[PDB]
Write a protein that binds this ligand. Structure first.
Ligand SMILES: CC(C)(COP(=O)(O)OP(=O)(O)OC[C@H]1O[C@@H](n2cnc3c(N)ncnc32)[C@H](O)[C@@H]1OP(=O)(O)O)[C@@H](O)C(=O)NCCC(=O)NCCS
Ligand SMILES: [Ca+2]
Ligand SMILES: [Cl-]
Ligand SMILES: [Cl-]
Ligand SMILES: [Cl-]
Length: 142
């Protein structure tokens, strides 16, 4: 009998390696609204040593961090693109992630897009799908 395994096929060690090594995060869909999940996860990641660049062309600053209108506008290397936007918006952000030389595209709950995941894979990025960075951090490293 096999148990529910994650759709992205990554082991707990694979996720642990990502969470340990890749800490330059572009958090797409960042929001200053305390009720938004993007706000909660951004606050958590900042508390745990992540360098979190908010990405949302609507805002100039989120949680005291300069907020950028695209992943490509960030003046630093970016390792993980952490997605908090609706599925169809993720295609453009994956294209930006590829151009930026990011290593990991991370689909948070309710953001998964098959075509975007396809592009990431073909470009050699790691895909994390239907997981939360905060929940995975709490579970594996907390
Ligand atoms: C994807 C998700 C954000 C959709 O929720 P929703 O209520 O429909 O919200 P919307 O997508 O309309 O808007 C969310 C934010 O996206 C931002 N957004 C919209 N278009 C954007 C774009 N092109 N680029 C960057 N951000 C954008 C908006 O500004 C908005 O923030 P605001 O409310 O401060 O303006 C929601 O399902 C998400 O929170 N999923 C992740 C949940 C989960 O992983 N939580 C973890 C808990 S452990
Ligand atoms: Ca494009
Ligand atoms: Cl996938
Ligand atoms: Cl604004
Ligand atoms: Cl704020």
């Amino acid at each position: 009998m096999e148990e529910t395994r994650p759709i992205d096929g990554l082991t707990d060690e694979d996720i642990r390696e990502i969470l340990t090594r890749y800490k330059k995060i572009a958090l797409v869909g960042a929001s200053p609204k305390p009720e938004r999940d993007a706000n909660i996860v951004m606050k958590y990641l900042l508390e745990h040593g992540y360098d979190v660049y908010p990405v949302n062309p609507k805002y100039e600053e989120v949680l005291g961090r300069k907020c950028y209108p695209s992943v490509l506008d960030i003046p630093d290397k970016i390792e993980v693109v952490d997605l908090f936007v609706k599925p169809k918006l993720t295609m453009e952000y994956v294209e930006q992630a590829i151009k930026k030389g990011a290593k990991v595209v991370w689909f948070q709950y309710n953001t998964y897009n098959r075509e975007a995941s396809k592009k990431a894979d073909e470009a050699g990025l790691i895909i994390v799908a239907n997981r939360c960075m905060m929940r995975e951090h709490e579970r594996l490293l907390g």
